Write a structure and sequence with these properties.
part of a larger assembly; 5 chains; A: mainly beta; B: mainly beta; six-stranded antiparallel β-sheet; three-stranded antiparallel β-sheet; toxin/protein transport; protein transportation; TcdA1
Chain lengths: 87, 179, 179, 179, 179
Amino acid sequence: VSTLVSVRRVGHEDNNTVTALPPLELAYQPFEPEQTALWQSMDVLANFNTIQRWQLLDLKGEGVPGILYQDRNGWWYRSAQRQAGEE
Amino acid sequence: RALEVERTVSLAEVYAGLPKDNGPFSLAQEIDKLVSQGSGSAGSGNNNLAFGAGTDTKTSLQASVSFADLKIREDYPASLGKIRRIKQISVTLPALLGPYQDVQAILSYGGCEALAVSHGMNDSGQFQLDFNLPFEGIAIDQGTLTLSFPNASMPEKGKQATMLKTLNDIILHIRYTIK
Amino acid sequence: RALEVERTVSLAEVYAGLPKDNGPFSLAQEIDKLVSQGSGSAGSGNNNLAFGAGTDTKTSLQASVSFADLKIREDYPASLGKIRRIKQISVTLPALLGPYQDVQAILSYGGCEALAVSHGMNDSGQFQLDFNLPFEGIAIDQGTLTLSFPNASMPEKGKQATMLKTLNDIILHIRYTIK
Amino acid sequence: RALEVERTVSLAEVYAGLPKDNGPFSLAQEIDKLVSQGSGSAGSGNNNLAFGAGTDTKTSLQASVSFADLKIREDYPASLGKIRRIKQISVTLPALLGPYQDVQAILSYGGCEALAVSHGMNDSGQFQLDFNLPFEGIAIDQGTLTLSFPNASMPEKGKQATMLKTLNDIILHIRYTIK
Amino acid sequence: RALEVERTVSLAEVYAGLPKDNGPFSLAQEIDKLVSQGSGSAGSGNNNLAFGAGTDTKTSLQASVSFADLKIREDYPASLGKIRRIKQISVTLPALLGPYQDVQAILSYGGCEALAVSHGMNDSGQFQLDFNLPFEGIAIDQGTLTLSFPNASMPEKGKQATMLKTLNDIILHIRYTIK
């Protein structure tokens, strides 16, 4: 991507000089995945398996994927929620 | 070798497509009406939806249909053959079931005349279906095919009174042979 | 043991590649022209799309093809064997079906001379295609194979007439042996 | 009660791996060259790529391979059985055919000596393969296996000349027993 | 009749679970150590991993395990029976295979004592597993099960040397009956 990082208004005098304003400068959120890549254990998803009938998808709408296990008679769901603990 | 034909009959399109003398009706609206009150009727003749008549069937909702009005003989010309008889009938019930519930239904005929429905997904009556049968050899013209749902009364607090509220149509897969 | 070969034959590819002397046509355009009117014709000889001729088949569209003009004998050299007889033919119809509709079609050769197409997706006429058959042993370079669609007249209110408007092709899965 | 082993053999890796006293070649580029012109060969000995020699065969692009130069006997020690013979061979022609297309190819050996490849995706020469066969008992060391594609020369307007330029590799799924 | 039992045994969990007097180890860390070096050993007694000592198997990584150390007889009470013998054993090899690559492995016992693993994913040695067998009737206490990997040396340029680096575990699907 190209990101617009600096806009400046410049006036030019006739005696080959410059009348300049201080620039409006803009900063963007960076994508440096080589440094900030963090690995974390995932024990929340116990017995999740693509060999059996599990799925990361969202029912109920709700925009964040749940965990659906589906037998031929009943379906078992785990809706995504909020940890009340720390963050 | 027989001409081996599979025919799909929707009971809502049969009941609503009745002639106006006998009285057509919505299937899902009359099932919601018959189950919610004690008993009643919907339709006329052999294309009806009524309750049971006998003992220990008065809480059962029975959906009868007539083979002569399904007009299966017009699907192919009569120059192919006139020996048109049923090989196998299976029935799919698209409903909304509970967490671990089943469907109970008995497909009868006026021994190989009965057939129990257990899950309603192309449901033959058999544990494994082997062509190596119920309703086999019944002609596609004469007869009356009844699907009886036991425990279907909500005043009598039947267990199937909630599944039939979610039922929108009844689908029969008729396999028959022309020879 | 034979050379067991499968050949996929597309009738729109056959009808559009006739010689200009024989009057080629498009299968997709000519169906919804013949369905929308009562009856007409297409092509000439045995590679013709036309309504039926006999009693109770006049409201039935027939798509005939000739085995001699498919040129299946030139697919393999004549030193591998000079008899090439049909083992099994399946029909695939790229069409659109309704909510509970089926396909009514008869593949015939001019009980093992006919077949009844029901679902139209790799559709042999059997309930279980057991190889332990119709059209078995018909020589690949002689004869006429036709496919009749009953109730195909839209002025006569055919139930199969709206499926044929969407019918883009007729696919034939000819399995034959070179032995 | 034998050791039943399946070995997948890719024929482009064989032709790329001949020592350059016999002459290696890439299968995809030499097929495009030998189809576009009429004549031509590739490789040498029994691991060659040439045209047919006999009558009605000189437009068949033939791809041969030697059983001794596969070295299938080097995959297991000789201490567990010296008697290694073929149970079945299947052919895959990867990334060649569309959904309703067919290929004409004969896998032979120098009626259980030949095998017709038709769809080319784990393709045995059988309509319904039953293990209870062609090449059953051919020794692992000895012989040549030839895959011949009829109608494969482009100056003679072969029907397989356009599709053979798409061919990337030829895969053999050899299933043999060590007893 | 018999209690038809299935049991999944990880050789990485057996080799890690050895007592400290018997030298436990990580399976993939010693497989990579022994393949890269060409010789060496791991473990003690019957639960060892080494190259074969005989001729023609000097370059063959073999992974042995004792049936008495799998502790299968403690999985069910002794009141159920004592006739506890193997019906069938299949092997799962969770490695990284190529697009058309195969695993060469012989599962032995010290023609129904050996088994050839060829695709390594729920692999029984048969072309078709039919219960209507190797290692059948072997008791679940006596014996030693060995999985030998031919051509498993990087100094001697084995064709399976880089395959075995990716191998994480040797998973056995032991089916046995309690009569």
